[PDB]
Ligand binder design. Structure first.
Ligand SMILES: Cc1cc2c(cc1C)N(C[C@H](O)[C@H](O)[C@H](O)COP(=O)(O)O)c1[nH]c(=O)[nH]c(=O)c1N2
Ligand SMILES: Cc1cc2c(cc1C)N(C[C@H](O)[C@H](O)[C@H](O)COP(=O)(O)O)c1[nH]c(=O)[nH]c(=O)c1N2
Ligand SMILES: Cc1cc2c(cc1C)N(C[C@H](O)[C@H](O)[C@H](O)COP(=O)(O)O)c1[nH]c(=O)[nH]c(=O)c1N2
Ligand SMILES: Cc1cc2c(cc1C)N(C[C@H](O)[C@H](O)[C@H](O)COP(=O)(O)O)c1[nH]c(=O)[nH]c(=O)c1N2
Ligand SMILES: Cc1cc2c(cc1C)N(C[C@H](O)[C@H](O)[C@H](O)COP(=O)(O)O)c1[nH]c(=O)[nH]c(=O)c1N2
Ligand SMILES: Cc1cc2c(cc1C)N(C[C@H](O)[C@H](O)[C@H](O)COP(=O)(O)O)c1[nH]c(=O)[nH]c(=O)c1N2
Ligand SMILES: Cc1cc2c(cc1C)N(C[C@H](O)[C@H](O)[C@H](O)COP(=O)(O)O)c1[nH]c(=O)[nH]c(=O)c1N2
Ligand SMILES: Cc1cc2c(cc1C)N(C[C@H](O)[C@H](O)[C@H](O)COP(=O)(O)O)c1[nH]c(=O)[nH]c(=O)c1N2
Lengths: 207, 207, 207, 207, 207, 207, 207, 207
């Protein structure tokens, strides 16, 4: 396969739960192992913005997502917010790429300062110290100077700051076409195949 | 009225022509005077992403937009890319708020460095020196460190960096609901009434 | 009226509960709507430093403060520390000015880094991104370099850092005269009328 | 004794003359030698805010303060604003701790830039170059970014920035209880005994 | 005695519980008063890495450690994570030196930003503002740029960053010899006698 | 194979010769080519801390290490401190990963400033300019601000700063278990297989 | 005694050998233990500028200086430029204050960058990491921006930059009076008694 | 002639009046026009440190210095501290080199901040804006970080920071030989002939 075998997917409490669920579904279809983390505020966002009824405890959640995505047994792992025995908590774990989608401004702040107050924050801290891929998908507007400084610090270090800012150049016709644009970008960044967004200009020889 | 009487609306060559046209339409419905500027690359984007057939020369363009928006005669002014005799070129002009929507990374760069190579860039340079409102609506992903440094420099100065990153917390059902989210934010930032996006929590007394 | 119609008043766990209660009372007398937030540590400070017996749950608290201040029904709203459905949590809310009085060094840190770990921190993050008034009233001594850097970063962005450092130039005769000095400064900063602190030199024509 | 034998106490033209006089009295009661400096603006503040009738010339001033404090002959020395032959002017002097209480924003600026335009400013410049204790007690609100940058620069160098921001956690009952809080902090910082402010938690074993 | 009478010893959730317990034992043998704080994650680390069965509540914990160390009654105080009435919470407390051993990257971050979210973080914030000794003993590898910036900021302020990086120049023969190397360095830094690590070169006159 | 075929292993004069020798042995067992460099001070450290009798001249040294490690003929190359004709001296060489283990503070300084005064320093300078892997394993305590600034500068550029700070979370029972922890981290960072340190949480599915 | 029992005195190759020899003599008369280091260039300077015939090897040098100063046996220790077994090389040594007098611009550079290329440079690196007194006495003119940046970096960390810039305010009558001025300042900085330079203003009561 | 025809020589209140008087005498002997400025504190220093009885008012001072130096009529001009009609006050004046010898730390501060509070400070401000030579001769020890930052800022701009730190490499035999060393350096920097300090190595061909 091209791209990482394992992805840590963390969903935090920005608007855009749809982007996280669609990414999880795409990663499952590409036969990747997903270590799934979700914050308390992100549970509230998913309850507010979607009709997904996500169970709260990790084992129930894991069984639900496995069914939702049509995943294989053990393909999706779910770890709680204080589970320091989970792989993402330590850099001695097997290497994963990590994506925080959506990434709240609070989680962006914790990653930029190194707060490590829960497993999502520590997992990102570990990605940075081990030089493993870290993609943050903020959804906010305006972005204040506090947000922008945190994004710049992390981008300079090598994290990818990929805002949930879909393009329109393929004439999207639904909300799902816009969600898929951003998910396609995340997968492209990870090196994972995707067929939702064409390769710009691939057939253009000259003019 | 609340908010500015005159807005300079510049459209530059990022994806998201729909956001600029919808904003222009909203500003027209709120009886504002609009000084409309559009870059050459933005003309190509609007031809690519929309079915709007925008004439190229300023007088033809002005007549077309006036009809498209149902604007009053003289409500929309159109100025060419090198028209230094137009109001946005000088700080001795009557005060306007300015919005660049969509804002390409190239235009964001020119504003942050002060390049003033065309009327959009000079008009933003003038907004900054006169302390008049300047809102930039970038549409790009990932945002690189070059993009983020330019955004931070401008935000620290007092420009509003408002990415085209729509929220989902009112369960959008179409592309237009997502376009309207971002346009509502721009209007809110300008102080101009809008009824597309509710006031969060306005009826929530306690819990 | 002059000044904002709505103020978000957050009390956090620095010494000086008296300043927050007196400000709340003044804002009520000036017929303003107050969205009142209080941290867990600030509840302990108010229990320690005052004889105010503040109930813990938001509805009981709201009823108590309404009676304490002689407020109109619905004039004081109380929101809990994780209530993301409350107006201060989103920039799509109606605009309010925000004051954190007293502001602990921990809350000052969270605002400067963008931590957003509770509704007070997120509400300040939202004030900054929307360019709405934000006044922080720290009470600490010494101020360390960590405190001072956080204050400078926020002041450079446009927050007002208004320490609880009363002046003596009107020969104060009680603790309340010193509390009123600082509250008068906050109200002056907000643009809200106050008659506790005279306008310096207003009758001085020459010398 | 614990703490310094000699303190240079400079009073400059911020509000809060009471803090300087109370500190002088406490230092006298602790049998310390005080080198007392006072600016022209601080003389005006003491005339405005207190009923202390302080004579203007150094010898008359010295005799007055000696009587006011019940000091021993020669315990309080008074030096004029241009007296470069006084001990605080040179680092070849015997070592003293220095406190500027109250510290105006102008004096804070001079210390941070090294202006040395009078004996107070030079004495602080000398404390810094010799690594002798320097405590600044600003009284201002708001603190602007100019004030905060000057405070941060000096704090990073090792000066203590101790704002006149009294705490309330011992339920103060008078203006004097609040003045004594700040004076207690200064003495604590200097290492000089004081019995006005208890040692927090000293009898708390567990909970 | 040489060195401080009282030490605040905080253990946080980095690997290396052995260093904290050995330091506590050494400080007890040197007849020092210890104010002992431990984070929730550090309790899990001590359960994972050691055979010490540490009770969870502060009074039970205090009684256990008193027996483990052979301490005198009241020599070890234990305070909970939110106990703001404990001495380390306020700079008006009696002066202590503070050591965080081991220091997690999350606690290092909180100290560098001033987050004060629990008593360990606030106690370090207080050490810095009062200029009292603060020694951080991080255990992590690699150290990322986020870790290193937090360490540099604190070191520039005057905190000692003492990594758990034992030397081998006395030919250690057990894990305990390596634990004792680091503990000896901490005690040396505090000015507290220790006989585990010889004074390098003390008998070398020339060569 | 996974990871680099060739590693430049430089040992410099920090304590911890054991880490360098164990790493060399592991790299030999993984059939890697090693270009081995050692400073004069590191020779003294190895004589002081170990019972390894390392010959001083490069050919004798090469023959000794080949026997010590059970290496194949030509698998270990040894180059002298001024050998500019050796592969590590030029970026036109075949690509190698480089590790400095242990890394003295002096060598860390030379790499951060670009001093290139010997082949170890130049080889690191070359790794940086060619963007080849560079891992520094400092062993020092405390780390001063000079050390930390040099580490941050290099980490921001992309070098891995991996302190000799072993973890204890697998209950180490000997000095060798702690040496192996750090060596395992280096090999993990290089992408080279190792079976000394388990993959954290690899069998943990949920909780 | 007041001040340190042991001083590491390093002489490096700036002009002003007289200041180093006079300081060594004063420290001997004050019954201090001196660990004496001298660079190769400083030997040339002492041969050029003085009639002191200093033997080159450490034991001969030690015997010569002992006789020159009238020191007790073992009061002056001499260590060679690569003697890493000497006390100044390690922070596990007994604590000493360190003075580099004169300090060449090259040695100032090495200390500011952390080069540690000889025992003088490492000894200063160790003073900084252990927070032990470090006084640098540069003699150069002009001071370039490279010199000044190195001095500022070190001063901000807590080293004392004490240029060989004698004062004239006691009407010096010989070269020795000017040498003694600077030596008096060094001793004052160290806290060591000296009777060459009076305490400025000590008898001035008022004016 | 080589070097400038006109020099503005300002003496400010650092110790070292001898350097200023000797420089004035040398410039007179080299037939240069000198615009002489002296601060009030520098008058006190010259009264304290020398037997020069300098009259206070500019015309009397001018006549005295003309006689002291054996200058031609009009060769030395003297301007008062507030004389804005004097040539040094404006950059439209004829070009002069400027030297401040000695330069107090207060004058160094004013030049680095641009305070222009008297003619010496404004004259230096004018030298900088016109890119005319500016040489500052500070005499202070220690130099604090405030002094060093002011010196670095000015050196980076192109001012020469030439401390009064005489060399000894020509075996000086009197105070005057040391004064002449520094004066020779100033003249060398200005490009003005001097025969007090030989050209180092001028006759050394090889070795
Ligand atoms: C319905 C809804 C919608 C949003 C939010 C909340 C809720 C309930 N929050 C606020 C955010 O959740 C809050 O600051 C949390 O503290 C973030 O915590 P986590 O980073 O998820 O731990 C939020 N935060 C943000 O950065 N971007 C956003 O778009 C939104 N939108
Ligand atoms: C269809 C299409 C789509 C895009 C673009 C172009 C075209 C033709 N370009 C590139 C952009 O137009 C180019 O960098 C121009 O140089 C921008 O010039 P102006 O800032 O408009 O003068 C572009 N640029 C960007 O910053 N964000 C984007 O989303 C896009 N998308
Ligand atoms: C009685 C009392 C008095 C004080 C405090 C506490 C208590 C109980 N705390 C400490 C502060 O409450 C602690 O750092 C909290 O973590 C702050 O949390 P919040 O910012 O309120 O969420 C405190 N903090 C501070 O910054 N300034 C202060 O004056 C005080 N005084
Ligand atoms: C009655 C009164 C009250 C104040 C002041 C003045 C007077 C007369 N000033 C202004 C201050 O004195 C002025 O900026 C001086 O220039 C300060 O000079 P010194 O620093 O004392 O030399 C003043 N300055 C300040 O920094 N904080 C304050 O609280 C006050 N309050
Ligand atoms: C067994 C074990 C081992 C470690 C950890 C955890 C556990 C359970 N954690 C992670 C750390 O505990 C987590 O980031 C916490 O959030 C730290 O919180 P406190 O700083 O203790 O409040 C951890 N953190 C770190 O900085 N260095 C380390 O060596 C380790 N090792
Ligand atoms: C036995 C022994 C032990 C140590 C040292 C030396 C010796 C002989 N040195 C000092 C170091 O070797 C010295 O600063 C050298 O200048 C480093 O030179 P290289 O970087 O190897 O060229 C040393 N340096 C350091 O950074 N960390 C350490 O742990 C030690 N320990
Ligand atoms: C007679 C004589 C005089 C001086 C010098 C040399 C000699 C031989 N050198 C130059 C200095 O010695 C050279 O840069 C060395 O490299 C410094 O090395 P150390 O720092 O002593 O190891 C010199 N360097 C300096 O910084 N200030 C000075 O005053 C002098 N003067
Ligand atoms: C006898 C004597 C000696 C000195 C001083 C003074 C006196 C009277 N002063 C202090 C300096 O004069 C004071 O800070 C003035 O404010 C400087 O003002 P001018 O820069 O001359 O306007 C002083 N200042 C300094 O920077 N270096 C020094 O060597 C001395 N020495």
């Amino acid at each position: 396969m091209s791209g990482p075998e394992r992805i840590t997917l963390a969903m935090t409490g920005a608007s855009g739960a749809q982007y996280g669920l669609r990414l999880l579904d795409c990663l499952v279809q590409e036969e990747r192992e997903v270590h799934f983390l979700i914050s308390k505020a992100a549970q509230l966002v998913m309850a507010t913005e979607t009709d997904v009824a996500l169970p709260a405890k990790p084992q129930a959640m894991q069984a639900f997502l496995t069914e939702y995505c049509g995943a294989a047994a053990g393909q999706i792992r779910v770890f709680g917010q204080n589970d320091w025995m989970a792989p993402p908590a330590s850099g001695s774990s097997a290497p994963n790429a990590m994506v925080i989608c959506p990434c709240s401004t609070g989680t962006l702040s914790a990653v930029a300062t190194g707060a490590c107050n829960n497993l999502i924050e520590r997992a990102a801290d570990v990605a940075l110290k081990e030089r493993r891929p870290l993609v943050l998908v903020p959804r906010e507007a305006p972005f204040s100077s506090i947000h922008l400084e945190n994004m710049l610090k992390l981008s300079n270090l090598g994290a990818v700051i990929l805002p949930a800012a879909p393009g329109f150049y393929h004439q999207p016709q639904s909300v799902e076409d816009l969600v898929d644009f951003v998910v396609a970008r995340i997968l492209n960044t990870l090196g994972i195949p995707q067929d939702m967004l064409p390769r710009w200009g691939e057939q253009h020889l000259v003019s």
